Design a protein around this ligand. Structure first.
Ligand SMILES: [Mg+2]
Lengths: 191, 139, 195, 348, 109
RNA sequence: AGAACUGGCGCUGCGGGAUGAACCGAACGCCGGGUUAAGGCGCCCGAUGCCGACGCUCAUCAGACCCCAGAAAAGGUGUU
RNA sequence: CGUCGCUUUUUGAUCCUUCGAUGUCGGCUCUUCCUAUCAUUGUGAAGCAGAAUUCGCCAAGCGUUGGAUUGUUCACCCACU
RNA sequence: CCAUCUGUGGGAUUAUGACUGAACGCCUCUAAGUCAGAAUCCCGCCCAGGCGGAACGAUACGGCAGCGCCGCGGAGCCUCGGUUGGCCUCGGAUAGCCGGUCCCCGCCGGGGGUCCGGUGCGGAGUGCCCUUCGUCCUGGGAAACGGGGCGCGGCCGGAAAGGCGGCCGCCCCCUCGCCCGUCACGCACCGCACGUUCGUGGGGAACCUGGCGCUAAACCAUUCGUAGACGACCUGCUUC
């Protein structure tokens, strides 16, 4: 079709300041900073105006699979804005039958050492992506909490745990055992 | 990023084609790759030139959407594009590119003798600034 | 005498056909840094048809027969050979004017390198489509010299900064020197006829 | 077409050109990786296999049915007199592989090293290194000799060590040194290279390179058997007795339409004398041989903590086809490639 | 003192695909790479200079080992600045890729 | 396998279809210049090295030229 | 009940090639290839509780035997796997 | 296997499960961007080492001979091809280029504000020599390093194929190594081709020709048996 442009904008609150080197975006905020390069995605970005901080992503030329990626851009900025002010917290809970899951942390809140999963002798050590924090819950049974700024480093690491607790050579519809994610939240609440 | 657009009234240079080397005024974009243009004060009349033919310049003209030749003629010489186009650094480069093409054999000799002269002058002078640059760094 | 082609950013087939014609016309052509030649189509696609190339193997003894080269220099060399009449002695002599080098050797690191804008990826592919590097489909297929080459590139390119850093030192100087004019009698005739 | 009965391949195609190998001394195809943090050390060593005996050891392996009992094991013993380091080779890497940078040899080299550099030592005037020794002592040749270690230290990334064997200490009639070139895999290259200038023309024992119960590899050239037929070279099934023109032959050496004899078929040629590398041969004992004459040399090999005799590992009557061992030795569990009196390079 | 001739390589014989024609050569005169700008070189005498081991000259007073085959530029050949020339003998096919020597002689400029 | 009608091959080369009995151009004394048919013009391989026009399509088995040398029903929120 | 295909390991149909000759069944022996996968790796689905099975996916790396009868290919049986 | 011993790990990923996430305001493993993933695949380990290369040793006396290196002039023999060199940033492409005050890496590099330019003119559509016919007379402008070298001495840079480059002190020497102007001369060979360079090229044979050096080793024959069809292969041969 080759339409004339589309554009979404992303409003920026005051404690976070987005600066851009190009199609690379640098996001500094209160609880750290993080950056993403979009040198594959063929769009211009424009932060415009002092004292209000609006980011304008627009694509002038394009087709229907090139128009679909202008929202994917602006929805990745809002995960960089939300994660650098609030952060991400994926609470996940252990579900077990007869055998209780023994889950500890070896290395400074990075390595996760899972044993006594389904009565097996084999420990399952999970080393995580750099930028998340491991923490066994308090005032709750068998809950594991991951905290960090960047969603794709939180969420991929929360996927490695759930994938490691995979029941093999069995009926997966019974034998419902695993450390499944149960909540998608923030580190700081209600801002 | 994208500091100059096409637009109703945008002055464009025409690089190749049947009107190669003349300015035009973009009047109406017609479909996606073809634009209605004219130049009333630069000897190119009204037609649809393709966009890959043209070169965007940085002069805009505030005339209405798809007017006649007359109002574009008024806006061309109210804004006085032709003196502003001569007094730019890019039409000096296309002026300079044709002066070098019509350089005769006798002038090309005279350029050669006056080129190899002044490059002696700088080389016998740029050596002096090297000579004083170590003389700072020797104490 | 001899032209020197930097090979990165170029396409495999678009560059090697232009090398194949310029080498039939008597020139001596040297393509340098043929590690980063791009090749169209995504990487898993092009890695398939190179693995299909590896099993084209004569049954009775694979020692004689198809010689699968794996360095991206000889990948590029073999592409030129299929666009030459190499079974004739005019096509044999055409290959002897081609000398292809991976990385940048020291006879050819201080020359000025040329590019072919016919064959560039920036020119010729639509930017929203995927391409493959010849360096890492060589590395995926038995080329065991990627690390020892990419070490010698950054040893090469670090020595090339300190040359260019001091070059723009030199031409800041002869531009500061030509401010000290004293010569505008000679500046008449060049600006008159394109300085 | 579809054989009716599946059998596997006779022989391995991984060792295919069953060729007389181009070397009598085994070449190390690939040295062990070297890291700067680990101490500085050699990696291989030359030895001469002398024969086999067996042994009696107390096994200790929990879980098995043998645990805490006596087991006999067949062991080979390899007489390894201490090597003498002679030269230092550096290798700088290219994108065409490793390349020899340059070599520096010792000041005065031995006489049995020089015997390696000649195919006719008797008809010779022995003139090797006579002009190369004079540069260690003439000072103009010396202040550039130290220059070639500093350019060695700067550029090349893996350095090795040229050593040879002391063939004066063996009962063989050979007297030519076997000149090997082995790799120092220690720390960084400056400590790796000052570790070799310090010990040119000095001996390197075997217990300094290897250790007890430190599992190594044997590299050798196999027992050469000559030009032998199909059923012995490849262990192919013999034909039944009634067969005209021949029993011990492979019958069908291929189909019709490939129309050529394949490489993958078994036929007659040279068996043995091939280069092979064994993997995972355990060391049992590093013995030392035939010490001082102050009181007595002391034979005292093969005297374990339960035997306590004046034994020595050379058996009663001397080794068959080898001689009588007077040197430092290594004993290795299992069979080991080669005839007796044959060079084979032990390697980590 | 200096070069009074423009450089050109002998690219091949005029040919179809299978059969080739020996009587007409074709050239790639250097620096000219379009059919519109080849009109200068038409009619120009062009030469193929080579060596042997016996001797001949016309003007030099002593015969040297250099000898030559003359010939002239006939017409244009396709859209890309090629040029076909018809010499007085045929080129020996040793000359493929080697230069020839295109003079400026029969001048209308 | 067997008929009809016209042409062809057999008796017949040449250009094009990579290769070829019959297909498409086209028929032949020995040559020079000119031009074309059928076919083509990234490089083998003569000629697009045109600032060619407009769209369509991404394949982890793409596709690519009469005869002609490989495929169907059915299905696809893949795009148009 | 229909109906659309593929393959040339069956048999036909054909008679183009070989009648101044291409040695004609099977077995033995040995190599290599194909996948339309029996097992083995990693998986998805069951009317998958477990165990055993069954249906599908990437997949030909590796294996797929010993005998009684019979010229047998095929068949049938004993036994292991 | 009728005795004994040994048999070796990485990468990208297939199937498939997923991550964020649009298209389609939600959803969704996908469209761009990610993760895990295997008897398959490629490599390692291992077997052979290319009309593929390195590094190093030794380089022929005797009695006349002989052989390298450097410095040479002198001819003829054989193979021909070219007619000025560019001596270097990295790269990006919905982007880059130059100059720049301020705070950080043993008197140099990392950053940001600022100023420029940009169908790139600090433009290989370009740049430097140059289209140098020579010299003499003879003035202006430009320039006080001289520039070639058989110079001698010195340094230190460039290992991926360094086989090249930069700097310095003395020196027979030039003080005409440029641009404009004055003066008159040279083969002015009588209209004409292969001219003009790289080039005192490449390769071989010899001779008059200065200095500096150098004084071996392969193969056979003999022996060995770690080897063997034969060749090949591994070895010995001192007046102790
Ligand atoms: Mg190796």
């Amino acid at each position: 079709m080759k339409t004339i442009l589309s554009n979404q904008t992303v409003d920026i609150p005051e404690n976070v300041d987005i600066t851009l080197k190009g199609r690379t975006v640098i996001v500094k905020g209160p609880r750290g900073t993080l950056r993403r390069d979009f040198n594959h995605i063929n769009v211009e970005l424009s932060l415009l105006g002092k004292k209000k901080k609006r980011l304008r992503v627009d694509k002038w030329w394009g087709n229907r699979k090139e128009l679909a990626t202008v929202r994917t851009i602006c929805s990745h900025v809002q995960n960089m804005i939300k994660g650098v002010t609030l952060g991400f917290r994926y609470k996940m809970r252990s579900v077990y039958a007869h055998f209780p899951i023994n889950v500890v942390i070896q290395e400074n809140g990075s390595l996760v050492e899972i044993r006594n999963f389904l009565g097996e002798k084999y420990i399952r050590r999970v080393r995580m992506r750099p930028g998340v924090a491991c923490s066994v819950s308090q005032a709750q049974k068998d809950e594991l909490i991951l905290e960090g700024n960047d969603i794709e480093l939180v969420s991929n690491s929360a996927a490695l745990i759930q994938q490691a607790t995979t029941v093999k050579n069995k009926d997966i519809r019974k034998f419902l055992d695993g450390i499944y994610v149960s909540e998608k939240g923030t580190v700081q609440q209600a801002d | 990023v994208f500091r100059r657009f096409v637009e109703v009234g945008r002055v464009a240079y025409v690089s190749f084609g049947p009107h190669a080397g003349k300015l035009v005024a973009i009047v109406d974009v017609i479909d996606q790759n073809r634009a209605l243009v004219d130049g009333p004060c630069t000897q190119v009349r009204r037609q649809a030139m393709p966009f890959k033919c043209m070169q965007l310049t940085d002069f805009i003209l505030k005339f209405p959407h798809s007017a006649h030749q007359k109002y574009v003629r008024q806006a061309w010489q109210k804004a006085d594009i032709n003196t502003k186009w001569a007094a730019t650094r890019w039409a000096k480069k296309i002026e300079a590119r044709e002066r070098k093409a019509k350089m005769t054999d006798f002038d090309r000799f005279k350029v050669m003798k006056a080129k190899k002269m002044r490059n002696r002058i700088i080389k016998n002078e740029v050596k002096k600034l090297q000579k004083a640059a170590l003389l700072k760094a020797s104490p | 005498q001899v032209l020197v082609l930097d090979g990165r950013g170029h396409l495999l087939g678009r560059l090697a056909a232009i090398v194949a014609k310029q080498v039939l016309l008597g020139r001596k052509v040297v393509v340098v840094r043929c590690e980063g030649i791009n090749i169209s189509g995504n990487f898993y696609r092009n890695k398939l048809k190179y693995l299909a190339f590896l099993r084209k193997r004569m049954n009775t003894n694979p020692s004689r027969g198809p010689y699968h080269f794996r360095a991206p220099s000889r990948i590029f060399w073999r592409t030129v050979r299929g666009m030459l009449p190499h079974k004739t002695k005019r096509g044999q002599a055409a290959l002897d004017r081609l000398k292809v080098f991976d990385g940048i050797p020291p006879p050819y690191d201080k020359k000025k390198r040329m590019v072919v804008p016919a064959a560039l990826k920036v020119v010729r592919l639509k930017p929203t489509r995927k391409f493959a590097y010849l360096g890492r489909l060589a590395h995926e297929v038995g080329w065991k010299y990627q690390a020892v080459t990419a070490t010698l590139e950054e040893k090469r390119k670090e020595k090339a900064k300190i040359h260019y850093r001091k070059k723009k030192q030199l031409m800041r100087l002869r531009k500061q020197a030509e401010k000290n004019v004293e010569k505008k009698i000679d500046k008449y005739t060049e600006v008159l006829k394109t300085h | 077409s579809h054989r009716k009965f599946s059998a596997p391949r006779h022989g391995s195609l991984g060792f295919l050109p069953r060729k007389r190998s181009s070397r009598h001394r085994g070449k190390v195809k690939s040295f062990p990786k070297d890291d700067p943090s680990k101490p500085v050390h050699l990696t291989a060593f030359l030895g001469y296999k002398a024969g086999m005996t067996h042994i009696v050891r107390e096994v200790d392996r929990p879980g098995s049915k043998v645990n805490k009992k006596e087991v006999v094991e067949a062991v080979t013993i390899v007489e390894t007199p201490p090597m003498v380091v002679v030269g230092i080779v550096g290798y700088v890497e290219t994108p065409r592989g490793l390349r020899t940078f340059k070599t520096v040899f010792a000041e005065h080299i031995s006489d049995e090293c020089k015997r390696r550099f000649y195919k006719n030592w008797h008809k010779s005037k022995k003139k090797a290194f006579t002009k190369y020794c004079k540069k260690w002592q003439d000072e103009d040749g010396k202040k550039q000799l130290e220059k070639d270690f500093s350019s060695m230290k700067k550029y090349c990334q893996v350095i090795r060590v040229i050593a040879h064997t002391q063939m004066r200490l063996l009962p063989l009639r050979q007297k030519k040194a076997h000149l090997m070139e082995i790799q120092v895999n220690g720390g960084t290259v400056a400590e790796k290279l000052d570790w070799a200038r310090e010990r040119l023309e000095q001996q390197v024992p075997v217990n300094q390179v290897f250790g007890q119960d430190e599992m190594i590899d044997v590299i050798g050239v196999t027992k050469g058997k000559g030009y032998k037929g199909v059923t012995s070279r490849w262990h192919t099934k013999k034909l039944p007795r009634k067969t005209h023109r021949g029993l011990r032959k492979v019958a069908c050496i291929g189909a019709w339409h490939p129309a050529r004899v394949a490489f993958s078929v078994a036929r007659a040629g040279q068996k043995g004398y091939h280069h092979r590398t064994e993997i995972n041969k355990k060391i049992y004992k590093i013995g030392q041989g035939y010490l001082i004459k102050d009181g007595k040399l002391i034979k005292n090999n093969a005297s374990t903590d339960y035997d306590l005799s004046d034994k020595s590992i050379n058996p009663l009557g001397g080794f068959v086809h080898y001689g009588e061992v007077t040197n430092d030795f290594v004993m290795l569990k299992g069979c080991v490639v080669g005839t007796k009196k044959r060079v084979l390079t032990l390697r980590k | 003192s200096g070069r009074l001739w423009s450089k050109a390589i002998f690219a091949g014989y005029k040919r179809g695909l299978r059969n080739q024609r020996e009587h007409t050569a074709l050239l790639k005169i250097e620096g000219v790479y379009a059919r519109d700008e080849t009109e200068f070189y038409l009619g120009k005498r062009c030469a193929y200079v080579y060596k042997a081991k016996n001797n001949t000259v016309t003007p030099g007073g002593k015969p040297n080992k250099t000898r030559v085959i003359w010939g002239k530029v006939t017409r244009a050949h396709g859209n890309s600045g090629m040029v076909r020339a018809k010499f007085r003998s045929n080129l020996p096919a040793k000359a493929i890729g080697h230069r020839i020597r295109v003079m400026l002689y029969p001048s209308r400029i």
